[PDB]
Design a binder for this molecule. Structure first.
Ligand SMILES: [Mg+2]
Ligand SMILES: [Mg+2]
Ligand SMILES: [Mg+2]
Ligand SMILES: [Mg+2]
Ligand SMILES: [Mg+2]
Ligand SMILES: [Mg+2]
Ligand SMILES: [Mg+2]
Ligand SMILES: [Mg+2]
Ligand SMILES: [Mg+2]
Ligand SMILES: [Mg+2]
Ligand SMILES: [Mg+2]
Ligand SMILES: [Mg+2]
Ligand SMILES: [Mg+2]
Ligand SMILES: [Mg+2]
Ligand SMILES: [Mg+2]
Ligand SMILES: [Mg+2]
Ligand SMILES: [Mg+2]
Ligand SMILES: [Mg+2]
Ligand SMILES: [Mg+2]
Ligand SMILES: [Mg+2]
Ligand SMILES: [Mg+2]
Ligand SMILES: [Mg+2]
Ligand SMILES: [Mg+2]
Ligand SMILES: [Mg+2]
Ligand SMILES: [Mg+2]
Ligand SMILES: [Mg+2]
Ligand SMILES: [Mg+2]
Ligand SMILES: [Mg+2]
Ligand SMILES: [Mg+2]
Ligand SMILES: [Mg+2]
Ligand SMILES: [Mg+2]
Ligand SMILES: [Mg+2]
Ligand SMILES: [Mg+2]
Ligand SMILES: [Mg+2]
Ligand SMILES: [Mg+2]
Ligand SMILES: [Mg+2]
Ligand SMILES: [Mg+2]
Ligand SMILES: [Mg+2]
Ligand SMILES: [Mg+2]
Ligand SMILES: [Mg+2]
Ligand SMILES: [Mg+2]
Ligand SMILES: [Mg+2]
Ligand SMILES: [Mg+2]
Ligand SMILES: [Mg+2]
Ligand SMILES: [Mg+2]
Ligand SMILES: [Mg+2]
Ligand SMILES: [Mg+2]
Ligand SMILES: [Mg+2]
Ligand SMILES: [Mg+2]
Ligand SMILES: [Mg+2]
Ligand SMILES: [Mg+2]
Ligand SMILES: [Mg+2]
Ligand SMILES: [Mg+2]
Ligand SMILES: [Zn+2]
Ligand SMILES: [Zn+2]
Lengths: 143, 102, 25
RNA sequence: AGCGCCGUGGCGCAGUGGAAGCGCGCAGGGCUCAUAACCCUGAUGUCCUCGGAUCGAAACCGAGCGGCGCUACCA
RNA sequence: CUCUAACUAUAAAAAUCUCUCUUCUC
RNA sequence: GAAUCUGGUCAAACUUGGUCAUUUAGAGGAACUAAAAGUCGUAACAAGGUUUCCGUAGGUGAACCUGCGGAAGGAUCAUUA
RNA sequence: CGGUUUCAAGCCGAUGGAAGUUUGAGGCAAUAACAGGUCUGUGAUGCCCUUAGACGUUCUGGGCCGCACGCGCGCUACACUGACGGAGCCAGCGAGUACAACCUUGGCCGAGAGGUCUGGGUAAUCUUGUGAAACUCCGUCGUGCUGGGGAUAGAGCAUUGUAAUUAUUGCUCUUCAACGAGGAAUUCCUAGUAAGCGCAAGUCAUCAGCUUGCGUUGAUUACGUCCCUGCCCUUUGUACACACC
RNA sequence: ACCCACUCGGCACCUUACGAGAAAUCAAAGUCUUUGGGUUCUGGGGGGAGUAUGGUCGCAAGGCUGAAACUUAAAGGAAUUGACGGAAGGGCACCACCAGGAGUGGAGCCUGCGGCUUAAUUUGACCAACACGGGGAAACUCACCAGGUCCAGACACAAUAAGGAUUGACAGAUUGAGAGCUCUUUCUUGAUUUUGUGGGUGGUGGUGCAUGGCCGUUCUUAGUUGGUGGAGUGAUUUGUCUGC
RNA sequence: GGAUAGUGGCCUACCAUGGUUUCAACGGGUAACGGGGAAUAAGGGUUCGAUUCCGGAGAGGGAGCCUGAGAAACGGCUACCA
């Protein structure tokens, strides 16, 4: 089980489980999106749609029933690396690189990474498609 | 190149025209590039003109006629065969097609 | 192509570089 | 230690009083010069182990097995 | 060198392709 | 009449910081070319299967679509039927 | 001849005649092309290759004919208009022996396929009138995977062939499966045509379900339209011209 | 208010080429190589890019201004005839449908393909391949294979050699073999040959993507053309076309 | 007025507010010494001119200098930086 990162080899830190893929006809259902979602304080749609954003292919999302289908032939390494891009761009904060940061909207629609240990409001890369995705669905309140 | 001398518009010195809307596709269309018709017709279908006439009071009637100025877009009009694609040497003839019936 | 979208993309990239300046300044 | 839930063909739900269910799976065929979409046809199974009720119980019930959601470490 | 009249109304889906490119003089 | 030496005097030059030009590394950041059997779709050329294209503004895996205004580069040069 | 046509090309109906769809069917059948196939037809061949333990040629034997499978031409049946016992008895294409073993008649033995003796026929004589089936009549079977269906699995009897095993082919008996009209889809078709049914001939030593023709019984439903799939002409736009792959 | 006749100015329009254009066309896009009325602003292949950068205006969205490196031989304009078009129109086909008929795909078998297997299941075809190469092949045929032969290796030169260039063979083994193929042994035969080379035949050997020839289809549709002659500089077009 | 071989904001002192500009100033750049010329060639023209002739400029970078008619000299000096 991953230590929640890729180019990071500690023995003590917050945990993430790897995600995998099963075949449908073709589109791969990813089993382990809700658990990583809870391990990163970030809803599963952000995981799936970010994977799509770095991927560039049609995708299907259904959170109520666990059938997360992403279309394409992607070996474990490719999607785990795209999710690594997710966690580095999104999950981990600046100073300590905390693998639990939430996504918060202030009175301005500044979608921002917010942490707990360092607790800063990390200046978010709003210049990404997942920023618009997250702003479309406010977290834990529109899902 | 140039499809038409009048650029299929027939504005030629008006700067702008207030747009109208198509009857079918319902698009904003310049009133001059807005091929349109007088769909003149009697109020009743030509088939039943007999029956209605003896089905009514007030003999020697007039049988009124309903009118409408129908504005057709380019796309709908060319679609419904009411305007025919033509050869360029045949396009330019602006004369109406010579009184359909006589 | 659609130069409409290319011009709009250039405007958006300029907007993003301007906002990166705005945070950085 | 006790109560509420469940018992798959490879997976999610369902009717459980006429006895293997669909989607999605898959093997194969159809269509197209070709691929997909689609169209269709077929293959896997002891609704958990054993009884009662019944013409017949996967099914109504039960005399228990395996696993779960609470009480809560209950001398 | 005498004519100014009739007329109608569909829009269902169709996605794609890596080939060789070759030469004209009484 | 040398030395020394009062003044100024041109002033090179040195320190000190400011200020600028050019090279100059540079964590990292953002692009473009050529490479044409990478992947996803098929935007366009015909009515490209929703006409295109333009300006504007929002959104949108990507293409692009959308609303408003336009133009024919359109598929109409055409109803005193 | 009557309609119909700017009264022209012609088209429609009727009369008459055998024939009134270009009378019916065919066969000849344009330019330009395809990287279509074929060097496996040649004594047509370029070029390359091997040319003496040979890729030449010949002799034997095995192989081209095997099978967890799929697809594509066909045949027989899924029964009652049937099947079966018998009777009745209509054809046209053909073909057939020389430097050799064909066509088989008739008569004799066998139940059969067969075998024998002769007989004509090099072909309007002879096979021949190919006494073909389908078909009809009279009986039987009686709606039961049953006298339908006969694949397949046993045993034997014959013939051709140097040579039949991996059942050549024919015959006798037994065995009698799957077959209840067949998913998605698809093919063919308009009059002596479709369908059924047989016959011949090519292949042939010997073997057909194959095919080429021939005839027998003999049709439902049109006499149309671009909906699908294409085609031809014309107009039109194309950023296609290796041409919507 | 109307009609006539003329004109001034305005938007335009129809014919024409008399010119001029890369033509499409234009009464201006003319009076432009016969090059010259006066005039401000623009562009020098396509990208990179209206991009970077520095200004400048702006509350902002953004405008005006505005490169270079780099990279490529075309991008592109008009125009041609084809092809295409889920574009339009005029006619067609029972290799399309319609009406139906009869079937195929269901069953078994036979045959033909593919794939698996084996030495090999010889090979070529994938509408116009697949009961086709007469491909219904027990030998052959044959092109596949485990083997066995044989030369049917001309001609020329050199080469040996009549005390032998050489061939053939009963019998045993050996080979299925009654093959003197091989040997053991001997006999026969004679200048045709034998061994080298130059050169040569055969080859259902390879290559139809080198070719003929043949036939298949494109395509049973109605299509195909040239000589003047005209229309365009031309590529071409008309003749072959409005209708019926 | 000083100073200079001698004019002149050359320098000073007192005043006056002026000078130049879209007819391109000033700034920046010049792998620019200017020219006579060279190449090229219908005509118009384009590019090059470090370099034989002319001028001007330097003697490592700046300055300061006596002598001498003539020097800010450099195969003459005074000094700093290299
Ligand atoms: Mg156009
Ligand atoms: Mg118009
Ligand atoms: Mg496409
Ligand atoms: Mg002093
Ligand atoms: Mg794909
Ligand atoms: Mg598209
Ligand atoms: Mg559509
Ligand atoms: Mg579009
Ligand atoms: Mg007549
Ligand atoms: Mg004929
Ligand atoms: Mg070919
Ligand atoms: Mg051999
Ligand atoms: Mg075979
Ligand atoms: Mg029978
Ligand atoms: Mg006869
Ligand atoms: Mg039976
Ligand atoms: Mg039978
Ligand atoms: Mg029959
Ligand atoms: Mg063009
Ligand atoms: Mg092209
Ligand atoms: Mg005006
Ligand atoms: Mg340029
Ligand atoms: Mg450009
Ligand atoms: Mg600006
Ligand atoms: Mg017809
Ligand atoms: Mg054909
Ligand atoms: Mg067909
Ligand atoms: Mg039908
Ligand atoms: Mg049949
Ligand atoms: Mg079948
Ligand atoms: Mg079958
Ligand atoms: Mg084989
Ligand atoms: Mg066949
Ligand atoms: Mg055959
Ligand atoms: Mg045989
Ligand atoms: Mg043999
Ligand atoms: Mg053999
Ligand atoms: Mg041979
Ligand atoms: Mg040969
Ligand atoms: Mg050969
Ligand atoms: Mg060929
Ligand atoms: Mg033809
Ligand atoms: Mg001519
Ligand atoms: Mg012609
Ligand atoms: Mg200067
Ligand atoms: Mg110079
Ligand atoms: Mg000089
Ligand atoms: Mg000089
Ligand atoms: Mg002196
Ligand atoms: Mg000096
Ligand atoms: Mg000097
Ligand atoms: Mg000197
Ligand atoms: Mg000295
Ligand atoms: Zn943080
Ligand atoms: Zn419309």
């Amino acid at each position: 089980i991953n230590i929640c990162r890729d180019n990071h080899d500690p023995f003590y830190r917050y945990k993430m489980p790897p995600i995998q893929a099963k075949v449908e006809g073709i589109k791969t259902a990813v089993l382990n999106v809700a658990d990583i979602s809870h391990a990163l304080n970030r809803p599963a749609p952000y995981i799936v749609k970010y994977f799509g954003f770095e991927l560039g292919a049609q995708t299907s999302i259904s959170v109520d029933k666990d059938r997360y289908l992403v279309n394409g032939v992607h070996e474990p390494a490719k999607l785990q690396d795209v999710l690594d891009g997710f966690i580095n761009k999104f999950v981990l904060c600046g100073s300590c690189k905390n693998p639990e940061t939430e996504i918060i909207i202030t009175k301005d629609n500044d979608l921002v990474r917010d942490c707990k240990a360092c607790g800063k409001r990390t200046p978010m890369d709003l210049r990404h498609k997942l920023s618009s995705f997250i702003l479309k669905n406010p977290p834990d309140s529109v899902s | 190149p140039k499809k038409r001398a009048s650029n299929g518009r027939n504005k030629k010195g008006r700067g702008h025209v207030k747009p109208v809307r198509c009857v079918n596709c319902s698009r904003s269309v310049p009133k001059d590039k807005a091929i349109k018709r007088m769909a003149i017709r009697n109020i009743v279908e030509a088939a039943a003109i007999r029956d209605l006439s003896e089905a009514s009071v007030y003999a020697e009637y007039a049988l009124p006629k309903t009118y409408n100025k129908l504005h057709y877009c380019i796309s709908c009009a060319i679609h419904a065969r009411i305007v025919r694609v033509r050869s360029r040497t045949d396009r330019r003839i602006r004369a109406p097609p010579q009184r359909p019936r006589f | 192509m659609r130069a409409k979208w290319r011009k709009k993309r250039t405007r958006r990239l300029k907007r993003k570089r301007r906002k990166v300046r705005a945070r950085s300044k």
